[PDB]
Design a protein around this ligand. Structure first.
Ligand SMILES: Nc1ncnc2c1nc(NCc1ccc(Cl)c(Cl)c1)n2[C@@H]1O[C@H](CO)[C@@H](O)[C@H]1O
Ligand SMILES: [Cl-]
Lengths: 377, 111
């Protein structure tokens, strides 16, 4: 057995190509993705869902977003600017970052690939629970814009975890492989991969001719995702509470959290029907918040954000010296790409060109990495 | 006009009411240990460590209550589902009162 692992910033996914078909493995809790979270307590280490569930009770010794620190030096613009927003401690070990935590009372410290090996041990254990075999061979994916140190740091993380890293494959190369784009014939084909997740937005241009891939260009927005769309709804409904009850809910953490959770869920509902209802009883000062939002209202709240997803697209094409007319395939990955308006904008950019979106966009990178680990295996 | 579908909702709410009862028992357990630990037994540095262990567990209780709320907040009950709507709201206010109990504890120990 050989597995493909998407090692995500927020969540990870493991596939195995078996019986002519990729099976995206469900974890011990029944979920097809696993949060890339690790928590240290008085008594034990928690990885995945167990580590995410308890991030409110222990935010200090709960580590995440380690993929933003892996392979980087300590004064990377990026390590510096995300350190500002992480409850866990990033220390400087002679210019390399290490996460410091409290674990059974002893203060412990860990390089990001020790934290990332933890998640890879999780994903590996996960697949072995489904298969009832030992699992050691894997393909692990990285972002196309990853450098040598970042590629090697990830490979290491796998090796520390007991895996045999058959290869490190870029995420868009993984997605493209999922859609049998490497199987097409003859003439060279340009491929735009549109990766919009919960928190980031990555654009890639790749070329494929005869099953041979090259990265052309890389763009994106490091802090645009579904979380920004949830906030636009939160603002909308806070202003609406204020209009109907003349109450300001926004300094109530638990009311805003309740609202925001109903927002995120209603948003998903809006990718598949045209109106979402919400009932939150006793939201603030005992007052029931019953409301409803249409897909057009949700779209309008996010209008600038949806269309601005096109400036990394145009900008990736600039960098690749390609006319928007010379992209032969468009592929959608990351969960926020279910939003119809976004699928629509994009089609209407590529003068009405079709899109590859039939494989669950949360699952497509691990799918492709599965398909490729079986071939390399 | 009692309908078969309302029974579905009343069953969810009953399942949620029994979880709520588990966390309320945890909250009772915490208050009991609080009372006993503040009751002098340990040197004050060691009490502090004990009280911070409880604090973290009150935090988990708060969290567990929030997760129940979040799931209650997924229900859509027609106006004619009067029995369900009353149960949903009874339950929300129960949790909310329990949440005040937690804050009261958490607010005092381990800062
Ligand atoms: N149908 C959808 N419409 C709009 N956005 C969706 C979306 N699905 C997701 N993500 C995946 C998802 C599926 C099921 C669940 Cl219960 C969850 Cl929490 C997330 N997202 C967003 O993708 C990001 C990664 O999860 C998140 O922003 C999520 O809200
Ligand atoms: Cl997900």
């Amino acid at each position: 057995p050989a597995v493909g692992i998407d090692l995500g910033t927020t969540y990870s996914c493991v596939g195995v190509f078996q019986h002519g078909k990729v099976e995206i493995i469900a974890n011990d809790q029944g979920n097809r993705t696993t949060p890339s979270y690790v928590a240290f307590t008085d008594t034990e280490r928690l990885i995945g869902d167990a580590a995410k569930n308890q991030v409110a009770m222990n935010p200090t010794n709960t580590v995440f977003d380690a993929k933003r620190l892996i392979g980087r030096r300590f004064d990377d613009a990026v390590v510096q600017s995300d350190m500002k927003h992480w409850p866990f401690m990033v220390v400087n070990d002679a210019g390399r970052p290490k996460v410091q935590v409290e674990y059974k009372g002893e203060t412990k410290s860990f390089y990001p690939e020790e934290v990332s090996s933890m998640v890879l041990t999780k994903m590996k254990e996960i697949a072995e629970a489904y298969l009832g075999k030992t699992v050691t061979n894997a393909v692990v994916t990285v972002p196309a814009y990853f450098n040598d140190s970042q590629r090697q740091a990830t490979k290491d993380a796998g090796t520390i975890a007991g895996l045999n890293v058959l290869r490190i494959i870029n995420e868009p190369t993984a997605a493209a492989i999922a859609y049998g784009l490497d199987k097409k014939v003859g003439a060279e084909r340009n491929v735009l991969i549109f990766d919009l997740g919960g928190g980031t937005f990555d654009v890639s241009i790749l070329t494929i001719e005869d099953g041979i891939f090259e990265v052309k260009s890389t763009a994106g927005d490091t802090h645009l995702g579904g979380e920004d769309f949830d906030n636009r709804m939160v603002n909308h409904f806070i202003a609406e509470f204020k209009r109907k009850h003349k109450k300001d809910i926004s300094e109530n953490k638990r009311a805003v959290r309740r609202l925001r959770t109903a927002c995120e869920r209603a948003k998903r509902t809006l990718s598949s029907s045209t109106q979402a209802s919400i009932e939150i009883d006793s939201l603030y000062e005992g007052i029931d918040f019953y409301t409803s939002i249409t897909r057009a209202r949700f779209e309008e709240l996010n209008a600038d954000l949806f269309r601005g997803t096109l400036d990394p697209v145009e900008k990736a094409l600039r960098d690749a010296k390609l006319d928007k007319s010379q992209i032969h395939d468009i592929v959608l990955v990351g969960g926020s790409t279910r939003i119809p308006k976004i699928q629509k904008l994009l089609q209407d950019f590529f003068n009405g060109k079709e899109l590859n979106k039939s494989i669950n966009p949360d699952e497509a990178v691990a799918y492709g990495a599965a398909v490729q680990a079986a071939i390399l295996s | 006009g009692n309908s078969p579908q309302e029974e579905v909702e009343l069953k969810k709410l009953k399942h949620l009411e029994k979880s709520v009862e588990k966390i309320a028992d945890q909250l009772e357990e915490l208050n009991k240990e609080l009372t006993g630990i503040q009751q002098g037994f340990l040197p004050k540095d060691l009490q502090a460590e004990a009280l911070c262990k409880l604090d973290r567990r009150v935090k988990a209780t708060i969290e567990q209550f929030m997760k129940i709320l979040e799931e209650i907040d997924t229900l859509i009950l027609p106006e004619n589902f009067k029995d369900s709507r009353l149960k949903r709201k009874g339950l929300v206010k129960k949790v909310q009162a329990f949440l005040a109990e937690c804050d009261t504890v958490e607010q005092n120990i381990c800062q």
